[PDB]
Amino acid sequence: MLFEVVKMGKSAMQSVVDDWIESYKHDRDIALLDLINFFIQCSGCKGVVTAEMFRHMQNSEIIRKMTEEFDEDSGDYPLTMAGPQWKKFKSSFCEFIGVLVRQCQYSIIYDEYMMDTVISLLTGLSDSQVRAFRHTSTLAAMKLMTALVNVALNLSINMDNTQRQYEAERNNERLELLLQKRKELQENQDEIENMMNAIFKGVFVHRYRDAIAEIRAICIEEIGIWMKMYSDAFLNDSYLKYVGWTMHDKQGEVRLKCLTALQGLYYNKELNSKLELFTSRFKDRIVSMTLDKEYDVAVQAIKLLTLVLQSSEEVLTAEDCENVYHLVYSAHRPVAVAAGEFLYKKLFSPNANLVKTLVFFFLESELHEHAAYLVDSMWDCATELLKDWECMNSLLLEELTDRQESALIEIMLCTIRQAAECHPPVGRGTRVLTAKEKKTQLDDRTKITELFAVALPQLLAKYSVDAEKVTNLLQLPQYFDLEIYTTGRLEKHLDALLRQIRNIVEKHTDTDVLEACSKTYHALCNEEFTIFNRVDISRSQLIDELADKFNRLLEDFLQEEPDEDDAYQVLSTLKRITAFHNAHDLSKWDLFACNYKLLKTGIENGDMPEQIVIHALQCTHYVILWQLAKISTKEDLLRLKKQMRVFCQICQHYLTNVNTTVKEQAFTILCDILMIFSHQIMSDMLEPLVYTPDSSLQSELLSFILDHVFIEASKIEALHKRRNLLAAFCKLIVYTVVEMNTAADIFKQYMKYYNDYGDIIKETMSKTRQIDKIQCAKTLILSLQQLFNEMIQFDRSSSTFSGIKELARRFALTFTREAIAMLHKDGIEFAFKEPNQGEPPLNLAFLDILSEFSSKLLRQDKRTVYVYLEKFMTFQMSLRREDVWLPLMSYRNSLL
Amino acid sequence: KRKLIVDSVKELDSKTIRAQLSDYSDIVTTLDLAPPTKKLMMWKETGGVEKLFSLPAQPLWNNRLLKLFTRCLT
C-alpha cells in the first residue's frame, strides 16, 4: 500500500513516514517488509515479497525472483512515464525518502536493523541489469545519501556545541556526562560515515558511469547537492573529480548537470580555495563548453564563467574572455544574452564613457559590421545605457574620430529601432506585447521623437557628406510618432529636415542613400498626420526640380555624340528620379516619354551604359504601375495598355542584351508585370488590361532560367540573385501565367540542385499539386522523360541512370490514384513509343524508372494498369525473358 | 519475449572515460553567427520560400504598388 499511498498523492509525506515509524516501533519486521516492497514496486514491479522470502532468501535471490514476476506489459516503469501524475510521483517518492531518514536520525537510524537492510537492498537493485531496478534504486539511493549528509551535518554541529560545553567545564559530575555524550556522538558519526561509504562506493562509483545517461545525470546531480550542502566535508578534490570527468560526458543532459552543480558552489556563496584549484584545472574545458554542441549547456557554461569572474578575475585569460565576447554575435539569443551579461560585468562594471566603451568594443569586433545583434544581446542588462539617446546625441554634436562617429551612429540607430518596434532582430525572436512593455514603448517613442525632431536636422547637416552615416541617420523618422510634430510645436524643425534631405538627394548618387531619402519622405507624407501638406509641398517642389534637370539633360544627350561625362550626368539625375518614383506617385510628370525615348534609343544604338538602361527599365516599370494604381477615365485605361504592351516588348529585347545584369533586370521586371497583369486581376472588371505572353515570350523566359539559374569568395550573394530569379519564374508557373509543361525543365533539377534550389522547386511541385492533382503527375514524368533522353547521349544501367531512378523514388513519395494512373499511362506510352533491329523496343529501360511509381497503386488499379500495358506488350514479349528484357519483367512483377 | 528492459552492459569502462577526456571535439562546435551585415540581415527576413513566392522580384517600397502584385496571388 505504501507505493500506492505515494502514487495517489493523497496525503502529505511527513504523516506517511510517521505512520511507518509507528509500525516500525510496534513490529519491526512487518514494517521493513512493507518498506522493501515499496522500493521494488516503485520500479513498476508487480511482484510482492512475502514474509517467508524476507526471513529466508537473500537479496540476490529476491531480486531474481522479482525479475521473474515483474509482470510488465511494456518496457515502461514509473520514473520514465510522463504526465503530471508521474512527475508528481517522482517528487513524492524522493520526499518520502528524505523525510523518512530525517525523522529517524536520532534513534532508529542507529539500530543495526533498518538502515542496513535498506542500504544492502538498494545496493543490490542498483546492480541489476533490469533497468527499472537499477534506475529506481539509484534514485532512491542518491536521495537516501543526501539525507545522510544532512544527518551528518547536524551531528557535527551537535558535536561542536557539546565540545564547547565540555571545555567550558574546565574548572564535576557534569563533566563525565559530557565526556560520555561526546563519545556517543562520535560513535554516531562513525556509524553514519559507514552508511555513507557503503552507498558511495557500492552505488555512486558505479552508477555515475552507467550506460544509461538518465542515470549518470541522477548521480552528478546529487553529488553537486552534497558539496553545496556540506562543503566542509565534501567540497574537495576527492569528490569534485567525478564532476570534472563527467564534464566530458558524450550526452548533453549529463554535461548540463555538471555545470549546474558547479554554479551551485559560487552562487550565492564564496569563496573556496579547493574549488578554485579545481576550476583552474578545468578552466580550458569550461570555456570550450561555451560552444557546446547543445546550446542549453553552452548558456550555463557562460553563466558559470560569469560567476567565476566574481570570486576572481585572473583565472580567465585575455583570449578566454575574447572567445566569450564573440558569442554576443551568436545566432541563438540565450547564449547571446548570457555572453552579453558576461561582457557587461567584464567591461562596463555619467554614461558617456560607457557609450564610448560600447563603441570601442563594436569597432574591435571583426564578426559583425552592424550593431543590431550586439545591441540585442545587451538589451536586458544595459537597458539604461542603451536608451540614453541624449548622451549618445551630445557626443556626435558638441565637441570623436570619424570611424567611431560612424560606429556610434549605427549603435544609436539600432537602440532606437529596438525601442521603437518592440521586438528583437531577425533570428532573435521567439511577442504579443504586455501592458507595461507598450507603456515603455510609447514612452520611448516620445523621447526619441522629441529629441530627434530637433536633433536630426543638425545631425544630417554635420554628416551629410558621408554616405554610410547619412543612410543610417535617415532611417530615424520612420521610428517616431508624428503627432508630436504639431502638438509639440516643432514644425520649423521639420522644414529644416526636409531641406537637409533635399540637399542630400541632390548631391548624392549612391543607391542606398537615395533609397533612404525616398523611403523617409514616404514616412513623412502620411496623410493622417496634419503635417502631410507641408511635406507634400516640398516633395512636389523637389521632384519639380528633378524632372526639369532630367529633360534639359535629355535634350543635349539624344542627338552631339555624348561621352562618359554626359552619361554620368544623366545617370545620376535619373537615379535620383527612379528611387523616388518607386515610393512616390510622380504621375503628374509624364515621365514615360523620357524613359521610353531613353530605352528605345538604347536598343537602336547598342551603346548605352548598363546603369542608365537598368534604372530606366526600373523607372518605366514604376510609371506604368503607378497609373494602374489609380483606376477614373476610360482613355486613361487604354493609354495604360499602350505603354504596358510596348514596355513588355522593350523588356524582351533587353533580355538578350549582351550585358548580364541588364538581362536579369529585364527578366525580373518582366516576371513582375506578367504577374501583375495576369488575369487574376479580377476581385472589378479590368478585363481589357490582361496580358498573356505569346509562346515566343514563354520560351524566351525559360531559356533565361536554364542559362542563368541552372549552371554549375562571396558567392552566396550570387546565389541570392539566382534564387530570386527562379522564384520569379515559378510564380508564373503556380499562378498559371505559363503552361505547367515548362515546370518539367525545372522539376528534373530538384536533386541535382537540391541545396541551391531544392525548397523553391519543392514548393513549386506542391503548389502545382493543389492546383491540378493529375497534370502535376503528368509533368513529373515528362521531367523523367527529358532526363532519359538526355542520357541517350542505349547501353548502361549507370551512375546517370541510378540518378534518374533515385529522383523517381522521390517523385513517387507524393503520388487519389487517378493521377498515378495517368502517370503510369504516359510512362508506358513513352516506353513503347519508339520501335527497334532484332527484337526490345527503344526506351524500354524507362520501365525500370517507372517501376519506382508502382508501389503507390492498388491491385484494382494495378491490373487496370496491366490491362493498359497488355495493349502494348505481346505474348512473345512476355516470353523472351533474358537478356535486355528485365525492365519489362520487373515492371510486370511490380504489378503482380 | 519480455518487454522488460534489460541492459547487457551497465557501465562505461574506466578506459573509455579516459578517452572521453582526451578528445571532446565531437561534442563541441563552431560559432553560429547571426547575419553579419544589414544586407544579409534583410535577406534573412525576406528570405524563405514563403516570402519569395509572395513578394515581387523587383521590390516595391509603397504598399499602394505592392497590393497590385499581392492582389494576383490566389
Of A326, A625, A730, the CB nearest to B68: A625
Residue A843 falls in which region: left (phi positive, over 0), alpha (psi -120 to 50) or beta: left
Place of cell 547536524: A154
Q: The C-alpha cell of A84 is what?
A: 503530471
Mention every residue, 6+ apart, whose C-beta is less than 8 A from residue A832.
A841, A843, A844, A872, A873
- Given 3-state DSSP classes, what are the helix, strand and coil percentages for chain B, each rounded to the nearest 5? 45, 5, 50
CA-CA-CA-CA torsion sign (A361, A365, A369, A371): negative
DSSP conformational letter for A528: T
DSSP string covering A686-754: -GGG-----HHHHHHHHHHHHHHTS-----HHHHHHHHHHHHHHHHHHHTTSS-GGGGHHHHTTTTTTT
Q: The C-alpha cell of A700 is what?
A: 524566351
Q: Which helix (H) or strand (E) holds A554?
A: helix A532-557
Query: Which A positions 424-443 lie with beta carbon below 8 A of chain B?
Result: 425-428
Contact B68, A628 (CB under 8 A): yes
Chain A interface mutation, best of B1, B2, B3, B5, highest count of A Cβ atoms under 10 Å: B5
Mention every residue, 6+ apart, whose C-beta is less than 8 A from residue A441.
A419, A420, A422, A433
Rounded CA gap, A146 and A227, in Å? 10
Q: The C-alpha cell of A160 is what?
A: 561542536
Inter-chain contacts counted by CB atoms under 8 A, chains A and B: 180
Torsion from C-alpha of A658, A664, A667, A672, nearest 10 degrees? -160
**Cα distances (Å, whole numbers) of residue B21 to A35, B18, B30:** 41, 5, 19
- Per DSSP, chain B holds a count of helices (H) and strands (E) of 4, 0
Contact A377, A337 (CB under 8 A): yes
Q: The C-alpha cell of A182 is what?
A: 561526546
Of A331, A370, A667, the CB nearest to B37: A370
Task: Tell me whether B18 touches chain A (CB under 8 Å).
Answer: no
Place of cell 550570387: A718
For chain A, domain boundaries:
2-896
> Which among A218, A281, A280 has a CA at the least distance from the CA of A249?
A218
Q: The C-alpha cell of A317 is what?
A: 585569460
Of B11, B58, B60, the CB nearest to A206: B11
- Burial code (b: 16+ CB inside 10 Å, e: under 16) for A693-702 equals beeebbebbb
Contact A388, A355 (CB under 8 A): yes
Are A763 and B53 an interchain contact pair (Cβ–Cβ within 8 Å)?
yes
Place of cell 490566389: B74
Q: The C-alpha cell of A207 is what?
A: 552508477
Contact A149, A101 (CB under 8 A): no
Chain A interface mutation, best of B1, B18, B26, B27, highest count of A Cβ atoms under 10 Å: B27
Residue A214 falls in which region: left (phi positive, over 0), alpha (psi -120 to 50) or beta: alpha
Rounded CA gap, A786 and A846, in Å? 11
Between helix A13-26 and helix A84-103 the angle, nearest 10°, is 50
Of B10, B21, B29, the CB nearest to A291: B29
Rounded CA gap, A39 and A215, in Å? 17
Contact A32, A113 (CB under 8 A): yes
Are B34 and A678 an interchain contact pair (Cβ–Cβ within 8 Å)?
no
**Cα distances (Å, whole numbers) of residue A249 to A126, A586, B13:** 21, 67, 13
> Which among A281, A333, A278 has a CA at the least distance from the CA of A302?
A333
Are A368 and B34 an interchain contact pair (Cβ–Cβ within 8 Å)?
yes
> Which among A644, A709, A704 has a CA at the least distance from the CA of A678?
A644
Q: Give the total number of structural domains in chain B.
A: 1
**Containing structural domain, residue B52:** 1-74
DSSP conformational letter for A330: B
CA-CA-CA-CA torsion sign (B54, B56, B62, B65): negative
Mention every residue, 6+ apart, whose C-beta is less than 8 A from residue A32.
A24, A54, A113, A114, A117
Rounded CA gap, A694 and A698, in Å? 7
In this structure, the number of other CB atoms found within 10 A of the CB of residue A436 comes to 8
Task: Tell me whether B10 touches chain A (CB under 8 Å).
Answer: yes
Mention every residue, 6+ apart, whose C-beta is less than 8 A from residue A719.
A756
User: A164, exposed or middle or buried, with CB in 10 Å at 0-12, 13-18, 19+?
Assistant: exposed
Residue A44 falls in which region: left (phi positive, over 0), alpha (psi -120 to 50) or beta: left
The values of phi and psi at residue A357, to 5°, are -65, -45
Cα angle value A664/A716/A376 (rounded, 5°): 120
Residues of A in contact with B32 (CB under 8 A): 330-332
Q: The C-alpha cell of A867 is what?
A: 490491362
In this structure, the number of other CB atoms found within 10 A of the CB of residue A587 comes to 13
Residues of B in contact with A368 (CB under 8 A): 33-34, 36-37
Amino acid residing at A604: E
Residues of B in contact with A727 (CB under 8 A): 49, 52-53, 57
Query: Which B positions 52-71 lie with beta carbon below 8 A of chain A?
Result: 52-53, 56-58, 60-62, 64-65, 68-69, 71
Q: What are the E-state strand segments in A277-333?
A: none
Contact A433, A407 (CB under 8 A): no
Q: For residue B24, give the chain A residue with the closest CA.
A: A248
Residues of A in contact with B5 (CB under 8 A): 75, 77, 130-132
Rounded CA gap, A260 and A136, in Å? 22
Residue ranges of the alpha helices (H) in A630-688?
636-654, 660-676
> Which among A1, A133, A109 has a CA at the least distance from the CA of A59?
A133
Place of cell 556610434: A408
DSSP string covering A190-224: HHHHHHHHHHIIIIIHHHTTBSSHHHHHHHHHHHH
Q: What is the largest CA-CA distance in chain B?
A: 71
Residue ranges of the alpha helices (H) in A560-635?
564-583, 592-605, 610-629
> Which among A800, A780, A802 has a CA at the least distance from the CA of A791?
A800
Q: What is the CA radius of gyration of chain B?
A: 27
> What is the stated resolution of the deposited model, in angstroms?
3.0
Contact A95, A147 (CB under 8 A): no
- Kindly report the length of chain A: 896
Task: Tell me whether A410 touches chain B (CB under 8 Å).
Answer: no
In this structure, the number of other CB atoms found within 10 A of the CB of residue A643 comes to 17
Are A728 and B27 an interchain contact pair (Cβ–Cβ within 8 Å)?
no
- Kindly report the length of chain B: 74
Residue A83 falls in which region: left (phi positive, over 0), alpha (psi -120 to 50) or beta: left
Mention every residue, 6+ apart, whose C-beta is less than 8 A from residue A104.
A21, A114, A115
**Cα distances (Å, whole numbers) of residue A365 to A325, A369, A843:** 9, 8, 61
- Burial code (b: 16+ CB inside 10 Å, e: under 16) for A373-403 equals bbbbbbbebbeebbbbbeebbebbeeeeeee
Rounded CA gap, A516 and A473, in Å? 9
CA atoms within 13 A on the CB side of A823: 31
DSSP string covering A811-822: HHTT---HHHHH
Cα angle value A810/A816/A822 (rounded, 5°): 70
The values of phi and psi at residue A489, to 5°, are 60, 45
> Which among A424, A327, A288, A290 has a CA at the least distance from the CA of B33?
A327
Query: Which A positions 749-778 lie with beta carbon below 8 A of chain B?
Result: 759-760, 762-763, 767
- Burial code (b: 16+ CB inside 10 Å, e: under 16) for A785-804 equals bebbeeeeeeeeeeeebeeb
Q: First and final CA of chain B: distance in angstroms?
A: 56
Rounded CA gap, A770 and A37, in Å? 61
DSSP conformational letter for A73: S
> Which among A677, A767, A697 has a CA at the least distance from the CA of A727?
A767
Place of cell 544595459: A382
Mention every residue, 6+ apart, whose C-beta is less than 8 A from residue A570.
A553, A554, A557, A562, A612
- Cis peptide upstream of residue A194 (ω within 30 degrees of 0): no
Q: The C-alpha cell of A457 is what?
A: 536636422
Residue ranges of the alpha helices (H) in A69-113?
84-103
**Cα distances (Å, whole numbers) of residue A367 to A293, A325, A404, A428:** 20, 11, 17, 17
The values of phi and psi at residue B11, to 5°, are -115, 145
Rounded CA gap, A156 and A467, in Å? 73
Q: What is the CA radius of gyration of chain A?
A: 40
Q: The C-alpha cell of A482 is what?
A: 508624428
DSSP conformational letter for A659: S
For this PDB entry, the determination method is: X-ray
Query: For A834-879, what is the HEC assignment?
Result: CCCCCCCCCCCCHHHHHHHHCCCCCHHHHHHHHHHHCCCCCCCCCC
